[PDB]
Amino acid sequence: AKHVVVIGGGVGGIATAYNLRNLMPDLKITLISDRPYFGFTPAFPHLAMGWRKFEDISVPLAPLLPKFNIEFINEKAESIDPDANTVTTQSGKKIEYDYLVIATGPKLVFGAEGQEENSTSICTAEHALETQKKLQELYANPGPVVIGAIPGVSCFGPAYEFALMLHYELKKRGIRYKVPMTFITSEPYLGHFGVGGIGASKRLVEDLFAERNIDWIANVAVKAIEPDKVIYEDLNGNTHEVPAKFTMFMPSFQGPEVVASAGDKVANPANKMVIVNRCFQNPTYKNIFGVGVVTAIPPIEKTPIPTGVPKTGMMIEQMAMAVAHNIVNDIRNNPDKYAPRLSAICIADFGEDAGFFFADPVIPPRERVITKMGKWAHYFKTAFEKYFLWKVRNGNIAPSFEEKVLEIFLKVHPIELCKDCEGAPGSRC
Amino acid sequence: AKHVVVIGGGVGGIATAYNLRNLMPDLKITLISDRPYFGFTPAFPHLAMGWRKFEDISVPLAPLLPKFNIEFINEKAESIDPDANTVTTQSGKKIEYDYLVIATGPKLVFGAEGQEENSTSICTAEHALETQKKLQELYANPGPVVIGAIPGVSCFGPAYEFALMLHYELKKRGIRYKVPMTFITSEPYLGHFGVGGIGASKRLVEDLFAERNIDWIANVAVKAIEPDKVIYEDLNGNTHEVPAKFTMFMPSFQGPEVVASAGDKVANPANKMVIVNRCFQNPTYKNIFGVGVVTAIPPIEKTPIPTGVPKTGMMIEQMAMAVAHNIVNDIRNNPDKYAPRLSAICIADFGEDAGFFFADPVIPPRERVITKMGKWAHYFKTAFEKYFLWKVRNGNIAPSFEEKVLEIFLKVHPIELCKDCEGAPGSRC
Amino acid sequence: AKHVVVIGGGVGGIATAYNLRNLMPDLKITLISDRPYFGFTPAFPHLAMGWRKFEDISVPLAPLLPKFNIEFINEKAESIDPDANTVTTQSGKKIEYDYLVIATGPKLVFGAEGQEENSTSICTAEHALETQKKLQELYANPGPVVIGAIPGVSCFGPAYEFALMLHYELKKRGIRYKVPMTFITSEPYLGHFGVGGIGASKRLVEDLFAERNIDWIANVAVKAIEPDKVIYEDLNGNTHEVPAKFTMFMPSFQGPEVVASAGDKVANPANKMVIVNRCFQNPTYKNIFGVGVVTAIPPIEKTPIPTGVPKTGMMIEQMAMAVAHNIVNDIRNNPDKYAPRLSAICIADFGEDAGFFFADPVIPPRERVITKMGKWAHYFKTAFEKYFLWKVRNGNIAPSFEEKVLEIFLKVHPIELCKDCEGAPGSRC
Ligand SMILES: Cc1cc2nc3c(=O)[nH]c(=O)nc-3n(C[C@H](O)[C@H](O)[C@H](O)COP(=O)(O)OP(=O)(O)OC[C@H]3O[C@@H](n4cnc5c(N)ncnc54)[C@H](O)[C@@H]3O)c2cc1CS
Ligand SMILES: Cc1cc2nc3c(=O)[nH]c(=O)nc-3n(C[C@H](O)[C@H](O)[C@H](O)COP(=O)(O)OP(=O)(O)OC[C@H]3O[C@@H](n4cnc5c(N)ncnc54)[C@H](O)[C@@H]3O)c2cc1CS
Ligand SMILES: Cc1cc2nc3c(=O)[nH]c(=O)nc-3n(C[C@H](O)[C@H](O)[C@H](O)COP(=O)(O)OP(=O)(O)OC[C@H]3O[C@@H](n4cnc5c(N)ncnc54)[C@H](O)[C@@H]3O)c2cc1CS
Ligand SMILES: CCCCCCCCCCCCO[C@@H]1O[C@H](CO)[C@@H](O[C@H]2O[C@H](CO)[C@@H](O)[C@H](O)[C@H]2O)[C@H](O)[C@H]1O
Ligand SMILES: CCCCCCCCCCCCO[C@@H]1O[C@H](CO)[C@@H](O[C@H]2O[C@H](CO)[C@@H](O)[C@H](O)[C@H]2O)[C@H](O)[C@H]1O
Ligand SMILES: CCCCCCCCCCCCO[C@@H]1O[C@H](CO)[C@@H](O[C@H]2O[C@H](CO)[C@@H](O)[C@H](O)[C@H]2O)[C@H](O)[C@H]1O
């Protein structure tokens, strides 16, 4: 039987591994990850707020994967030799492969001066639990809060989420009137999201921030985060400072060193992310595939302050479907190749209500969008959390009824037959 | 009996002639037009989209007009000698008049370099049909679309209609995701219309364009249209390019050579349109009147990129009522004279829904506005098309019941008794 | 028997005296005011429009105050001696105090050239009644109207009310299509109000002005008001003019000479307003307190054209409660001290409909806001008019049920226990 190695035990890796296992019972699958657990990333802001226990939004992998006949190597992957078809781990183990799926997620860059030491973040479970400790210090003696995104950021949604959630928590403890709140972004306007807006999302986010007294500055570059202030710069080259006792900023993403260790035909020279085509396949090494945030996708828009394109859960699940069909078809000498649609349903949780965004596809021109807001969306978010964690524990990330439901309600088709893969990911075949 | 000559068989000419015939059965009336049909201009964008047949939106004049005792001459009117009270047609035929109504409509100016050769337009039935043929090539080989208005345009609505109708068509064909759309206009902002806006039209159109993925650039001057790009200049004097496979631009308007031949007391030197007062009568030759787009009306505001005032269907019908009454009162020695109210009910059809704009009067200060959008407004537009074509065929463009219904629903009165005609058209007596 | 003197028979003065009386029946209380009446300021725009009679919105104080054991002296206070605990009136009466409350309202500055002589205002009942006279001149001979605020203004609401009420009047008279209207403000944008906005107030007023054809110019400095034009200067320092037969502008505010007569420890050396701390107490003379418009509160933000913070009715009522309690506790050897919450409910009346604005606190960061518009709000303003006048005539500006009702509907509490008064008014202890 053939052998697939998957690097990374997160959303993209588990989904590709499970898709492969369900398509092909006797295929060999080995997953390598530095963390012994799968963590449900959409719940990290909630964890930082103290609204979750770590144990409730994570799944230990060692006792779980052998039930679905998948081998788990709890180690970090160190280098890739693509001519030799090998991955080497931190202890020195060499695993040979027929196909490689790289799904290592973000490598975080705290690009602002003093960001790593003076600020907080919520991108990992470990960073989130440390943010929670800083919040208890805030509640005890309130002060100015500033949240947002530095230049180069491509994941803007959790910043908006955390701000609105923190507003809600401060308000429930009756202390919001003692805490200034300011939001600062590299986005040219609020609700850009690195996608050029989704419908009238600019008007909607502006209205929401006004109603909930969150001040904002957009189309600027955050340059320094000090223990007592945040410094940013505008398009004229003028510098400005804003007071701050507690901060939470999004880092920007680059590719990891394990990817860089491969050629310049695999690691993008500008950012170290995986070079992929429409079919999420490396153009030069055809048995290497990219899934998730680690993939190199061109910006939708060249903004005055540089921003990038998000890779959301629904996009990543479509990547995982396409890639898994592409590997299985290659094994069987079926010439049909699939591109993911790259549409997205995103919910931004605000506390007891939430924003609902749908874009089809995410990269314009679009066939359609939906932008709505209500309490119903918050309960749908909590419900999807419980469903997705069930899916991880039961060994199927893509049950048939789910695709049918998204087709009934939203006219979504997750993957398309692609006649020519050669082009940037997101371009149409 | 007395003799009135009407030049032009369109909205303004038919309405004045019919108004005159019903006011005075004994009056001799001659209508001169270069086209053998009346064409319903508001259905031209729909003709361009292939949603109408020409025969369904036009009425032949020669077998019809004699039934209402109106003499039809199917020739171009070539010159006017206002001192001899004579009109001279292209074949040399000389027709003496007691009163003259000029209603020749717009003379089209394709002012951007290469516009007439490389672009399309929808202002005449013949141009609309040419546009339909070019759209066929766009559906077969999809590319970037740019639509809009060059400098000096005074009719913006049909450009907004066309853009939204095309978006609808592309979605019904399931190929909108393959076609970038950009809107480029001389207006200082979207929803200006050459009237400084109608209520919150700017916010309405901005939200509509964002919801339906129509990109836009306002407050610029389109300089050139090539086979492959559109070239515009900004207010800093810097030039830009946008890629373009299919384009549709509005031309600007001037007046005709028949008006120019009457001298500078009748022809406005700056634009060749008919010099008229408040009563739509010529100041120096008082047996000459102007009705419709050919009348010289000042812009409502001086915009950074030059723009002019629309003459809409409701405004022109009001011009026709006022003019017919003024002539008939002269014959009878009744010193009463009338100015049109110049209010407008406009519907921009977007395919399956539409925007409804009401302004009373169009030229500020206004008494009231209404700006709405829904499915209902689309069905009203179709309904009115049928109604207006019926009126042309049945010899009465102003049935009494219509004025009464407009009074009880929107509080409009079509004409006002004017104490002093001596002033610009649109200014208050 | 302890003795407190109150200067000013307005909102702040009446409210502080009544609070003190109800807290301590055996306290000696003297109120000094130059006007013999209480004037319900919120109905001055209505008075200027001719929609009220002066007698319906005022309360003579001489026969009223004795009823609640309050000594009334109808004289202007001219000097204060803080070291001697004395107040000197215009005649020459020296009044000794144990505690002093300064509440003399706004002292008006007509900063624009020709403003006092050529424009109109509505800040006093005298000015309001004179404005009504000029409005009759306008109806007789229609012409261009301009309304707004000059640099330094801190009270913007009444100018917005007046513009819309006047539009409404003209509409009922059927002459609005003959009257251009322009609103010119020192605010950086419409709906700033000197508070940095209340929810989406900017969007609301912008749409309102569009629907009702009121033109506007923001972020500029009105320099001159002439009999036929209004002159302003923009941020680039360029001069402009606008035609005008009728105008109404807000003047800016400073402190009175009676405050200046005390030390530069009492009078703010920039604007002459009363120097207070968080508990609305003077830092150096601890038996001196300030209430209402006369208190010196820093601007919420420094705007391009200078602008200041309003003191609305509800804000002033809470200042009065805190000050009354702070005096009583000092007498009773109770160390506890109180700061006002400074929340506000403001209704801007437009004629037949109105805008409802709620901000808690007015000075940010805020716990919550509400912005609404409808017919109900107009009837609400009329209802509060009747209710407040009743309270003045009945000796209790703070009946216990009102607090409970504000609590159950808006979650408002009027005052807070303050562990440290030492800081700027409106800052958090
Ligand atoms: C904070 C946060 C919130 C968040 N919320 C989202 C949401 O509400 N909806 C939504 O659609 N998307 C949200 N996203 C984005 C996205 O869904 C997440 O970023 C995903 O987690 C990304 O999926 P990936 O598979 O790309 O990354 P991963 O982090 O889940 O997993 C990577 C795994 O790889 C391991 N690893 C790293 N390096 C390794 C090496 N060298 N060797 C072996 N293994 C390696 C790593 O441990 C992990 O298991 C949201 C996104 C965010 C984040 S800022
Ligand atoms: C494309 C387009 C759409 C459009 N839609 C409108 C709408 O939805 N509502 C509305 O209220 N108005 C709309 N208008 C504008 C306006 O109503 C039309 O332009 C009217 O047709 C203008 O009426 P006129 O009477 O001014 O002109 P006409 O074109 O109808 O007819 C003039 C006649 O005169 C003839 N003629 C020209 N030169 C002659 C000489 N030398 N001798 C004799 N006769 C001559 C000509 O053939 C014609 O019969 C909309 C407007 C548009 C347009 S871009
Ligand atoms: C035109 C206008 C409308 C207006 N509308 C308001 C509204 O709808 N809601 C709201 O909440 N607030 C509104 N305000 C603001 C505010 O509530 C008013 O300005 C109050 O009237 C202010 O209260 P104050 O106590 O600060 O001032 P006052 O004018 O009521 O009373 C001052 C009294 O003192 C007398 N006086 C002056 N100088 C004296 C000396 N030297 N010695 C003795 N007495 C002196 C004076 O005669 C008066 O009795 C609105 C505000 C406006 C106005 S621009
Ligand atoms: C496992 C697969 C999951 C598939 C999920 C499919 C997603 C499709 C949902 C998007 C469609 C729009 O979603 C729908 O929008 C309307 C608004 O028009 C929402 O809102 C409506 O319901 C709530 C009920 O409390 C009302 O208060 C609200 O006034 C009303 O407008 C619906 O509650 C929501 O369900
Ligand atoms: C020849 C004579 C010409 C007659 C003149 C015609 C007068 C024009 C009247 C326009 C006034 C607005 O017209 C009216 O607006 C309301 C909006 O509140 C619309 O109401 C619409 O919006 C609501 C929004 O909740 C929808 O749920 C509803 O299905 C829809 O009907 C009416 O469908 C429309 O008829
Ligand atoms: C004794 C002191 C007085 C205590 C102060 C009372 C607190 C006031 C609370 C106001 C905040 C709630 O604001 C509430 O919003 C809704 C939403 O449109 C308003 O409007 C609603 O009622 C009106 C009543 O005719 C309807 O015409 C309208 O269509 C409906 O929407 C309510 O009239 C208003 O009461």
mmCIF file of N, CA, C and O in Angstrom, chain B residues 204-231:
data_model
loop_
_atom_site.group_PDB
_atom_site.id
_atom_site.type_symbol
_atom_site.label_atom_id
_atom_site.label_comp_id
_atom_site.label_asym_id
_atom_site.label_seq_id
_atom_site.Cartn_x
_atom_site.Cartn_y
_atom_site.Cartn_z
ATOM 1 N N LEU B 204 -27.624 54.783 -0.717
ATOM 2 C CA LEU B 204 -28.361 53.689 -1.349
ATOM 3 C C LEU B 204 -27.508 52.988 -2.419
ATOM 4 O O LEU B 204 -27.371 51.766 -2.390
ATOM 5 N N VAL B 205 -26.927 53.760 -3.340
ATOM 6 C CA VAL B 205 -26.165 53.197 -4.469
ATOM 7 C C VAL B 205 -24.821 52.597 -4.025
ATOM 8 O O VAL B 205 -24.448 51.527 -4.494
ATOM 9 N N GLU B 206 -24.117 53.268 -3.112
ATOM 10 C CA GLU B 206 -22.890 52.712 -2.508
ATOM 11 C C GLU B 206 -23.101 51.334 -1.891
ATOM 12 O O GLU B 206 -22.286 50.442 -2.088
ATOM 13 N N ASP B 207 -24.191 51.176 -1.141
ATOM 14 C CA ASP B 207 -24.533 49.904 -0.496
ATOM 15 C C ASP B 207 -24.936 48.841 -1.508
ATOM 16 O O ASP B 207 -24.585 47.683 -1.370
ATOM 17 N N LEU B 208 -25.668 49.256 -2.527
ATOM 18 C CA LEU B 208 -26.095 48.372 -3.600
ATOM 19 C C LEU B 208 -24.914 47.852 -4.425
ATOM 20 O O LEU B 208 -24.873 46.677 -4.790
ATOM 21 N N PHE B 209 -23.961 48.734 -4.719
ATOM 22 C CA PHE B 209 -22.765 48.362 -5.488
ATOM 23 C C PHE B 209 -21.865 47.389 -4.712
ATOM 24 O O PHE B 209 -21.365 46.417 -5.278
ATOM 25 N N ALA B 210 -21.703 47.641 -3.413
ATOM 26 C CA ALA B 210 -20.952 46.760 -2.510
ATOM 27 C C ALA B 210 -21.589 45.377 -2.326
ATOM 28 O O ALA B 210 -20.875 44.372 -2.226
ATOM 29 N N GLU B 211 -22.922 45.330 -2.272
ATOM 30 C CA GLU B 211 -23.664 44.078 -2.077
ATOM 31 C C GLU B 211 -23.618 43.190 -3.313
ATOM 32 O O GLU B 211 -23.696 41.962 -3.204
ATOM 33 N N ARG B 212 -23.497 43.829 -4.480
ATOM 34 C CA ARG B 212 -23.486 43.156 -5.776
ATOM 35 C C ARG B 212 -22.111 43.209 -6.489
ATOM 36 O O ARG B 212 -22.022 42.977 -7.698
ATOM 37 N N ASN B 213 -21.053 43.515 -5.734
ATOM 38 C CA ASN B 213 -19.662 43.459 -6.227
ATOM 39 C C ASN B 213 -19.394 44.307 -7.485
ATOM 40 O O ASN B 213 -18.749 43.846 -8.432
ATOM 41 N N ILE B 214 -19.914 45.533 -7.507
ATOM 42 C CA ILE B 214 -19.599 46.483 -8.571
ATOM 43 C C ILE B 214 -18.575 47.470 -8.007
ATOM 44 O O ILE B 214 -18.898 48.248 -7.099
ATOM 45 N N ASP B 215 -17.341 47.417 -8.516
ATOM 46 C CA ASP B 215 -16.286 48.374 -8.131
ATOM 47 C C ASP B 215 -16.579 49.732 -8.759
ATOM 48 O O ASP B 215 -17.299 49.814 -9.760
ATOM 49 N N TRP B 216 -16.018 50.803 -8.200
ATOM 50 C CA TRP B 216 -16.309 52.132 -8.737
ATOM 51 C C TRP B 216 -15.264 53.193 -8.466
ATOM 52 O O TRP B 216 -14.542 53.130 -7.476
ATOM 53 N N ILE B 217 -15.234 54.176 -9.367
ATOM 54 C CA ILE B 217 -14.364 55.333 -9.300
ATOM 55 C C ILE B 217 -15.206 56.551 -9.701
ATOM 56 O O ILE B 217 -15.721 56.617 -10.814
ATOM 57 N N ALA B 218 -15.363 57.506 -8.788
ATOM 58 C CA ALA B 218 -16.086 58.739 -9.095
ATOM 59 C C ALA B 218 -15.144 59.938 -9.118
ATOM 60 O O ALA B 218 -14.009 59.850 -8.653
ATOM 61 N N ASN B 219 -15.634 61.054 -9.662
ATOM 62 C CA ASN B 219 -14.926 62.337 -9.650
ATOM 63 C C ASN B 219 -13.643 62.322 -10.500
ATOM 64 O O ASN B 219 -12.630 62.933 -10.130
ATOM 65 N N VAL B 220 -13.698 61.610 -11.629
ATOM 66 C CA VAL B 220 -12.589 61.536 -12.589
ATOM 67 C C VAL B 220 -13.097 61.780 -14.009
ATOM 68 O O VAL B 220 -14.305 61.704 -14.275
ATOM 69 N N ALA B 221 -12.169 62.069 -14.919
ATOM 70 C CA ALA B 221 -12.500 62.397 -16.302
ATOM 71 C C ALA B 221 -11.980 61.328 -17.259
ATOM 72 O O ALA B 221 -10.761 61.156 -17.427
ATOM 73 N N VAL B 222 -12.905 60.604 -17.873
ATOM 74 C CA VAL B 222 -12.562 59.609 -18.879
ATOM 75 C C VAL B 222 -12.050 60.297 -20.150
ATOM 76 O O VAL B 222 -12.781 61.061 -20.796
ATOM 77 N N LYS B 223 -10.791 60.014 -20.487
ATOM 78 C CA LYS B 223 -10.068 60.676 -21.583
ATOM 79 C C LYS B 223 -10.046 59.850 -22.868
ATOM 80 O O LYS B 223 -10.081 60.406 -23.980
ATOM 81 N N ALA B 224 -9.951 58.527 -22.715
ATOM 82 C CA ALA B 224 -9.818 57.632 -23.862
ATOM 83 C C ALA B 224 -10.382 56.234 -23.602
ATOM 84 O O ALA B 224 -10.295 55.704 -22.488
ATOM 85 N N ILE B 225 -10.984 55.666 -24.643
ATOM 86 C CA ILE B 225 -11.450 54.285 -24.621
ATOM 87 C C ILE B 225 -10.798 53.527 -25.770
ATOM 88 O O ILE B 225 -11.029 53.829 -26.951
ATOM 89 N N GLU B 226 -9.972 52.551 -25.406
ATOM 90 C CA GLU B 226 -9.243 51.739 -26.371
ATOM 91 C C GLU B 226 -9.943 50.386 -26.488
ATOM 92 O O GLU B 226 -10.859 50.101 -25.717
ATOM 93 N N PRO B 227 -9.525 49.546 -27.457
ATOM 94 C CA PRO B 227 -10.032 48.172 -27.516
ATOM 95 C C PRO B 227 -9.786 47.329 -26.246
ATOM 96 O O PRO B 227 -10.503 46.348 -26.019
ATOM 97 N N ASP B 228 -8.805 47.707 -25.429
ATOM 98 C CA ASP B 228 -8.379 46.859 -24.314
ATOM 99 C C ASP B 228 -8.303 47.530 -22.929
ATOM 100 O O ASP B 228 -8.045 46.854 -21.921
ATOM 101 N N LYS B 229 -8.536 48.840 -22.878
ATOM 102 C CA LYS B 229 -8.478 49.600 -21.616
ATOM 103 C C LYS B 229 -9.234 50.929 -21.671
ATOM 104 O O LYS B 229 -9.542 51.441 -22.753
ATOM 105 N N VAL B 230 -9.532 51.471 -20.492
ATOM 106 C CA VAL B 230 -10.139 52.790 -20.368
ATOM 107 C C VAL B 230 -9.148 53.690 -19.652
ATOM 108 O O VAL B 230 -8.574 53.301 -18.630
ATOM 109 N N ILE B 231 -8.941 54.883 -20.199
ATOM 110 C CA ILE B 231 -7.983 55.833 -19.642
ATOM 111 C C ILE B 231 -8.712 57.038 -19.058
ATOM 112 O O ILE B 231 -9.443 57.732 -19.765
#
